[PDB]
Amino acid sequence: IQRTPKIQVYSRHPAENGKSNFLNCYVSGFHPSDIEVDLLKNGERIEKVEHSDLSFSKDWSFYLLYYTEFTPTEKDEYACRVNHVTLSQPKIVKWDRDM
Amino acid sequence: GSHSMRYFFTSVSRPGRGEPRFIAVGYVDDTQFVRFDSDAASQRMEPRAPWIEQEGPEYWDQETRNVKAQSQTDRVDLGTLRGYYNQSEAGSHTIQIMYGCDVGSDGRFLRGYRQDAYDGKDYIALNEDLRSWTAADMAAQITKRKWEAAHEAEQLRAYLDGTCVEWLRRYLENGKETLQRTDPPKTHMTHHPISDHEATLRCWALGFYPAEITLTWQRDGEDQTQDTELVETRPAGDGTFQKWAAVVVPSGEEQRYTCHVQHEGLPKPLTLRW
Amino acid sequence: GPAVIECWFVEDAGLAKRPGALLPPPRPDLDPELYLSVHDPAGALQAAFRRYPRGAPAPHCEMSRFVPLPASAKWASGLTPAQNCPRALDGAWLMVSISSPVLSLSSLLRPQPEPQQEPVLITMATVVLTVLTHTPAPRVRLGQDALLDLSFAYMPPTSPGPPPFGLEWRRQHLGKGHLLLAATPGLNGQMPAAQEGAVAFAAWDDDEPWGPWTGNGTFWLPRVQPFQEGTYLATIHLPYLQGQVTLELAVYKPPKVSLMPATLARAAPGEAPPELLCLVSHFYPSGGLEVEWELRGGPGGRSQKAEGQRWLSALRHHSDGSVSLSGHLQPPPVTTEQHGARYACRIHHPSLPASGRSAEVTLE
Amino acid sequence: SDVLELTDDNFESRISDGLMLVEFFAPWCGHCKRLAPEYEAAATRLKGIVPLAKVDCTANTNTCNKYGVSGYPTLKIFRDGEEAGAYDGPRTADGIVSHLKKQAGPASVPLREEEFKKFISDKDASIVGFFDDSFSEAHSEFLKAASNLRDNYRFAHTNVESLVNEYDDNGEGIILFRPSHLTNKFEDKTVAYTEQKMTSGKIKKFIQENIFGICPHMTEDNKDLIQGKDLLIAYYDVDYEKNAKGSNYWRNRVMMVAKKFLDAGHKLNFAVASRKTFSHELSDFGLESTAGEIPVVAIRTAKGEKFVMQEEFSRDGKALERFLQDYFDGNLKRYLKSEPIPESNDGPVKVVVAENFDEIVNNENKDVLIEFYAPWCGHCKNLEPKYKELGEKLSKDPNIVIAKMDATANDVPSPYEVRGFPTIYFSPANKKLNPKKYEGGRELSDFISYLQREATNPPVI
Amino acid sequence: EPAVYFKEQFLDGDGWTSRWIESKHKSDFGKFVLSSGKFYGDEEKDKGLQTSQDARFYALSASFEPFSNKGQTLVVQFTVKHEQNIDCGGGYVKLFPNSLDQTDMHGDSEYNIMFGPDICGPGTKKVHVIFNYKGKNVLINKDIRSKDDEFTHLYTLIVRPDNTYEVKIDNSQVESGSLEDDWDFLKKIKDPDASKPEDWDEAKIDDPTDSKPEDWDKPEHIPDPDAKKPEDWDEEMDGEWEPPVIQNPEYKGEWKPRQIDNDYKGTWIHPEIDNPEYSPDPSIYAYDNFGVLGLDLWQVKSGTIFDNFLITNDEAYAEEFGNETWGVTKAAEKQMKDKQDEEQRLKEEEEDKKRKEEEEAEDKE
Numbered sequence A: 001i002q003r004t005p006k007i008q009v010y011s012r013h014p015a016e017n018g019k020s021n022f023l024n025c026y027v028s029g030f031h032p033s034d035i036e037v038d039l040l041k042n043g044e045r046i047e048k049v050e051h052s053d054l055s056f057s058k059d060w061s062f063y064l065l066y067y068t069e070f071t072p073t074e075k076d077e078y079a080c081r082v083n084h085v086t087l088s089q090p091k092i093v094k095w096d097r098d099m
Numbered sequence B: 001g002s003h004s005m006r007y008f009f010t011s012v013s014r015p016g017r018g019e020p021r022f023i024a025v026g027y028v029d030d031t032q033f034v035r036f037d038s039d040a041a042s043q044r045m046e047p048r049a050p051w052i053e054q055e056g057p058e059y060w061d062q063e064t065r066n067v068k069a070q071s072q073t074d075r076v077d078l079g080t081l082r083g084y085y086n087q088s089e090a091g092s093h094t095i096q097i098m099y100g101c102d103v104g105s106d107g108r109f110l111r112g113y114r115q116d117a118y119d120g121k122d123y124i125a126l127n128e129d130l131r132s133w134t135a136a137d138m139a140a141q142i143t144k145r146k147w148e149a150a151h152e153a154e155q156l157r158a159y160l161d162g163t164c165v166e167w168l169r170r171y172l173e174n175g176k177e178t179l180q181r182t183d184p185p186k187t188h189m190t191h192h193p194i195s196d197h198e199a200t201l202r203c204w205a206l207g208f209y210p211a212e213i214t215l216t217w218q219r220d221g222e223d224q225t226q227d228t229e230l231v232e233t234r235p236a237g238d239g240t241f242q243k244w245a246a247v248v249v250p251s252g253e254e255q256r257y258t259c260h261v262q263h264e265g266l267p268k269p270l271t272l273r274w
Numbered sequence C: 001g002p003a004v005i006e007c008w009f010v011e012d013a014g015l016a017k018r019p020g021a022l023l024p025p026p027r028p029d030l031d032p033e034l035y036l037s038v039h040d041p042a043g044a045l046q047a048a049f050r051r052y053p054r055g056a057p058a059p060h061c062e063m064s065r066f067v068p069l070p071a072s073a074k075w076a077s078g079l080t081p082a083q084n085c086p087r088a089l090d091g092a093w094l095m096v097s098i099s100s101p102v103l104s105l106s107s108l109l110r111p112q113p114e115p116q117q118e119p120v121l122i123t124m125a126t127v128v129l130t131v132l133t134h135t136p137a138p139r140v141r142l143g144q145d146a147l148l149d150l151s152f153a154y155m156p157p158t159s160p161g162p163p164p165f166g167l168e169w170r171r172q173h174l175g176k177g178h179l180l181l182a183a184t185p186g187l188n189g190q191m192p193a194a195q196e197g198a199v200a201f202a203a204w205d206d207d208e209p210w211g212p213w214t215g216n217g218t219f220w221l222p223r224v225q226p227f228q229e230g231t232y233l234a235t236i237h238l239p240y241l242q243g244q245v246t247l248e249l250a251v252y253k254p255p256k257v258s259l260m261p262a263t264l265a266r267a268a269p270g271e272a273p274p275e276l277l278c279l280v281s282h283f284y285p286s287g288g289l290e291v292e293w294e295l296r297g298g299p300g301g302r303s304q305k306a307e308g309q310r311w312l313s314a315l316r317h318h319s320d321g322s323v324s325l326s327g328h329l330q331p332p333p334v335t336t337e338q339h340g341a342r343y344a345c346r347i348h349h350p351s352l353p354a355s356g357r358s359a360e361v362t363l364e
Numbered sequence D: 001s002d003v004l005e006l007t008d009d010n011f012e013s014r015i016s017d018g019l020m021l022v023e024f025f026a027p028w029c030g031h032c033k034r035l036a037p038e039y040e041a042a043a044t045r046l047k048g049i050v051p052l053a054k055v056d057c058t059a060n061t062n063t064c065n066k067y068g069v070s071g072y073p074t075l076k077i078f079r080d081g082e083e084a085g086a087y088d089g090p091r092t093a094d095g096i097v098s099h100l101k102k103q104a105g106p107a108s109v110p111l112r113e114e115e116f117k118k119f120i121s122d123k124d125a126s127i128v129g130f131f132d133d134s135f136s137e138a139h140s141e142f143l144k145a146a147s148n149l150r151d152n153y154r155f156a157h158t159n160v161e162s163l164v165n166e167y168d169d170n171g172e173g174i175i176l177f178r179p180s181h182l183t184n185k186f187e188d189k190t191v192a193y194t195e196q197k198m199t200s201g202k203i204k205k206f207i208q209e210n211i212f213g214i215c216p217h218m219t220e221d222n223k224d225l226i227q228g229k230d231l232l233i234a235y236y237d238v239d240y241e242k243n244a245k246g247s248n249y250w251r252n253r254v255m256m257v258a259k260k261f262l263d264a265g266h267k268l269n270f271a272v273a274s275r276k277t278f279s280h281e282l283s284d285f286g287l288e289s290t291a292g293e294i295p296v297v298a299i300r301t302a303k304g305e306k307f308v309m310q311e312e313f314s315r316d317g318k319a320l321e322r323f324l325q326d327y328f329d330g331n332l333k334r335y336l337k338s339e340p341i342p343e344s345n346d347g348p349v350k351v352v353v354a355e356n357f358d359e360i361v362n363n364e365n366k367d368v369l370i371e372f373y374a375p376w377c378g379h380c381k382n383l384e385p386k387y388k389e390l391g392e393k394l395s396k397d398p399n400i401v402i403a404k405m406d407a408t409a410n411d412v413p414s415p416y417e418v419r420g421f422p423t424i425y426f427s428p429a430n431k432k433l434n435p436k437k438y439e440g441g442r443e444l445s446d447f448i449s450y451l452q453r454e455a456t457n458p459p460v461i
Numbered sequence E: 001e002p003a004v005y006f007k008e009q010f011l012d013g014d015g016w017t018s019r020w021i022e023s024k025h026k027s028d029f030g031k032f033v034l035s036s037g038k039f040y041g042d043e044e045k046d047k048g049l050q051t052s053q054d055a056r057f058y059a060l061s062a063s064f065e066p067f068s069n070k071g072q073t074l075v076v077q078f079t080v081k082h083e084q085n086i087d088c089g090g091g092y093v094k095l096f097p098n099s100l101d102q103t104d105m106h107g108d109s110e111y112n113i114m115f116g117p118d119i120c121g122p123g124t125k126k127v128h129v130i131f132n133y134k135g136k137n138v139l140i141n142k143d144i145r146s147k148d149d150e151f152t153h154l155y156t157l158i159v160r161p162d163n164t165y166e167v168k169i170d171n172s173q174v175e176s177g178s179l180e181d182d183w184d185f186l187k188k189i190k191d192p193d194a195s196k197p198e199d200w201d202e203a204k205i206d207d208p209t210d211s212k213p214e215d216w217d218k219p220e221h222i223p224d225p226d227a228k229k230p231e232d233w234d235e236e237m238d239g240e241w242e243p244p245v246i247q248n249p250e251y252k253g254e255w256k257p258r259q260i261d262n263d264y265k266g267t268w269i270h271p272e273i274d275n276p277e278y279s280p281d282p283s284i285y286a287y288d289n290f291g292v293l294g295l296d297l298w299q300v301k302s303g304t305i306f307d308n309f310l311i312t313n314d315e316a317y318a319e320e321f322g323n324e325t326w327g328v329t330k331a332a333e334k335q336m337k338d339k340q341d342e343e344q345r346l347k348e349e350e351e352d353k354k355r356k357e358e359e360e361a362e363d364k365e
């Protein structure tokens, strides 16, 4: 149902500090499927923001997962901003090492 | 252990923007295989797994035709439900459905499930006996009576306890290297001191199969819940999964903490200690 | 209570709805064919409307065409041993479902063949069975017992008497959802095993000779957790009849408004104090439970909107079922003006106080 | 449809045929909808012999009310425009076609050798009657008996010199031929009447005492003629259509043991039934539809006693012989089917059960206050703590004993009658056959006062 | 020179009371007051008639010189603004002939043309454009959405003599077409004598690529391969044993060569054979005479204001007049509306802050 889109700032593998990785934002349990999700890296937004196709999340709602190539690191201000009907203000969750 | 085929479909109505967006996804146990997108240019059931690409043209044609029929039925259901609730034609509605079956280790039918929700709320669900219906509100009563008068439970039960079992067995046999196989999960200890009074100890486990796993935190035998942050299993995109269970323990008392992991990938109850 | 029940004549399908009126008070503006004179002989539907709070909004009403048929569940087969439909159930049947924040009931009325009357054109209907619920939305406490009230009133048939009553209790959280309760007083049979150790006071109020009779079927859930909250369906089986009634069971309990790092560190004037972690262990429900930062004793009166960073952690599902929250609050740099003032954090929730359980801390 | 649509306008005008089957039901009844295809097929297959017609009670309340129709579907047999009893048969096309064909006329099928061989080749028994004289009293008596028992047996007569000369010597006799598929080496396939005088009562008694023989095929058409007295049913894969070898093998052992048990003088009927056709009756004996080849034996006395064989059905017949010898020798103690007794009593309220109710509740030297409850009854759960406290407060009394049994998972005795949940019963010491039903309150004070004002000894603290 | 049939601007104060007549058919009719609303572009130019009674019906008509649109084009434009956020009301005008009584004008009065915005909830909000023909008021078969905001909108309706009509909103063409196609004032028919032939499928082929298998005729009952008899059985006493049988797994219904459902020319339909009742006259848009401009509707939430009423026969003149009226007041009106909206939001925020302070003070005690 129309619930707050649960965001998850993490990565595919371990947060390789200073090495190649892949930031991913898993936002599930939201309605409708419309949910503008973007990645941020040190204030500005990340270049790549490609997200997988949505599907029936565990909460019987929409589910989308974003990914992007970038060097994972807790020092770099890497976050995830989401905006939709349920998530009024652009919720920006800081992306640390994992979820 | 016990397999099960699940297929869901979501239809988002778009007033003034054309037909409603229909998205159908079909996964087994915890790994997708098929997927349909009304906005796509192919307009056919595409494969989401390598083991499902071996199907001939007949399977793709039948899956595409059935996907289109279900898309039209959901489109009509959007207007019908919109008119039964006295809703305006400007708002956007959402109609989701999830139908699947389960089978044990011997391939025998276990049970069937079929639920249909509207606007995120439950609308009409199928009973466990595969013969009666369950409505959520007064609007669902009309659909339950119409379905009962049309003998829909007979066809639904015949398709869930018949064709669904055969399709699930065939899919499990064609992709046994990824559906029935189980790989150990990569565990790792992560320590992060939050202050001089307590620290955070999270247990990671990436790359494993299947995705369904249970990880709990214990403090000298006692359950750490609900003081242990346990996140659900998420797919890493490469078919595997990853989990992690964190818990804030006292400054220097993380040695007594133990992490218990149990799932398909781990046949034995793993117990990690820092 | 409400004089005229402006219901929506449905099939159902819900397809659509038409103008419908249910009596009886002086209401001429009716649909005639749809407006049916309520003639409940048991008094359940009449008492439910007469006991309604004055000034409340009009409760939702939906009318449909009911058809007598045996229960689909095999457990209720004992209620229909004979393999034949009773001739007393002849005629058209209408199902009325009324839902609102005060109560939700569903009765089965039977209107006459024609609506021609000497005074005003209005169809006459007789209420057969009535399934009402006092608490439409169950608000059980986290860790306590939930008492879902459920009342019913049925009339005696043509030729028993002691008609067998069917108790069916279900729910759904995500979710399943299985048959929580299911009994049949008056006929010994194989019933489904009770789930979650829940009971039910399904029994007739009295053993009258003729009728009508009224029974009760309130459910009892020991130790209500967050996984049990959701929609609960209560159905009462009867000879070729049945009454459904939904309920919105929501959890709630006192919220442990813990003050993580409450006492701000003795920071000199001009330095940002430590980031107080507003803890909240054990609370319900999550809806409305917010964390606000206020600086009591500053430019405002009761409480001013404190500056600094502010964030909320993820929901933690404790072993006791109740969810716990933790909001990180980073106050700005305290100075001489902040000295003396009490930086409190208000916690809003359904079980918490109206003003919000706040935690103040004298700044340095 | 294929069946004639009868209404209140042309009911008494187009239903005056010789033998017309009326089916009064409603379109909303599930049984009527599920029986519509079988009714149409039977009506189409019975064209010219017997006509089939339906009646909608929802649109014809006069015709339905005149015949006393209270449930759907209601199948009634009309002869010459009048009621001729209801149709006591299965709701299938084969059953309606066979019953209607056998009841179309006459009561005694007259054979004019091919007709006799084809009529004695049915799946059910056949009561053929040889008579060379057309004005003999034996023929009239046989005709009356056939007309009086035509709804349960298949009568037939013939005057051929070959059949009458080979089936009797005095020119008048009654021969009862059983099913050819059930022929075994344990009993003859035909029984001849040895009575001196031929009467309707004697023919009915002999037919009702020799049609099934040692053990007949208990089906849905002859179940009412086999059940009633002490019968020993044997559920298994009874189906000679696509499985006659197994049915003959099991029936050979069942009839082999029943023959030896009956030749010694024991009085007990036997019969084999299918686990699928009589699956609804297996629950009365505690058996489940295993869908296997091993047959389950279940003895049911004429009064109501039920004896289930715990030992598996052996291929040598030793198990059946031991069970029969134990049932005839009085091995079955107090009749009380129920689940196995637990490890021991929990405390305070002694966990009573049918398997041990006669040893605790039936104590002649102590008053037991049983309390039958259900596992899904809220009142029983709310009364469990009060009952436990009451039982603990009287633990020092050696005469009173508070017990509780689950009426849903244990058969109640014949003396007790569980009406609702919960039902409390007070059984005194010198009154085990006349227990009093507790009707007072469900509180601790009420139980203490009742026990102190009814039991022989005052309740202890 | 454009022929100005009627022009109402409400720029002479109460002088408009001398040109407009109030219907006397109802004793509880709505009262119209000349005002400019809380916000507008010009305090004197935005002055117009506005409803001051909520949940009532207004009926105010204005007479003028009678004229006929035969051989020429008709142009009727009007500006309507619902600054009160009406949720169920109408804002259209009625064109009555010379035989209309202003003192008894009602909703059932005989009118010639009726166009204008119409709202009545979430599902009611179209531009009505009916027309009197054959004694029946035909409605436009096209869906024209109407404005529901609080700003001033301009609705113009043009009807040329060539059976052409065009409806514009805010000086923008929103609809257009022919009266014979957009209205049901009348083409073709199917030949009833034609019948679908029996050979026309609607169909199921047999054996799309198979041959005679022969072995497909399998028996209905085959002996079990693992049928092990019992060792305690004596075949010499019973004559034989008893080999059980079961349905063969390769048993099917007859020798059907996969009778799939097609090899299909499509759903047969009758061939169209013209139409005898085909009607669309050239004088459908021509009126006998128009000398009354009534305005009767039922609004539950008063607040709508109408002005800039024009009724000429030149499209260019109507476009210029519309651009020199609503176009010069929409900008200032929106600016004032935003300026007041800002102050309203600030006051709301202040009230919220005061409520929060009161709650904190009440919780501290």
Ligand SMILES: OC[C@H]1O[C@@H](O[C@@H]2[C@H](O)[C@@H](O[C@@H]3[C@@H](O[C@H]4[C@@H](O)[C@H](O)[C@@H](CO)O[C@@H]4O)O[C@H](CO)[C@@H](O)[C@@H]3O)O[C@H](CO)[C@H]2O)[C@H](O)[C@@H](O)[C@@H]1O
Pocket: E057, E088, E089, E090, E107, E108, E118, E119, E120, E124, E130, E137, E296, E297, E298, E299
């Ligand atoms: O609509 C085409 C029709 O318009 C006619 O003019 C109007 C109608 O006669 C009438 O308008 C109604 C009115 O309805 C509401 C109320 O009066 C009803 O009682 C309730 C219940 O049905 O529904 C509404 O609340 O107002 C609505 C909003 O303005 C409107 O949409 C609806 O059609 O009254 C007005 C004013 O008297 C009439 O102008 C024409 O006469 C006719 O030629 C047209 O075919």
Ligand SMILES: CC(=O)N[C@@H]1[C@@H](O)[C@H](O[C@@H]2O[C@H](CO)[C@@H](O)[C@H](O)[C@H]2NC(C)=O)[C@@H](CO)O[C@H]1O
Pocket: B085, B086, B087, B088, B089, E088, E120, E121, E122, E123
């Ligand atoms: C999505 C939808 O259909 N909403 C409907 C509501 O708009 C509607 O509200 C009612 O609308 C009427 C006009 O459309 C108003 O005249 C009426 O005052 C208004 N009533 C209320 C209480 O707001 C309701 C009417 O029941 O139905 C909804 O389905």
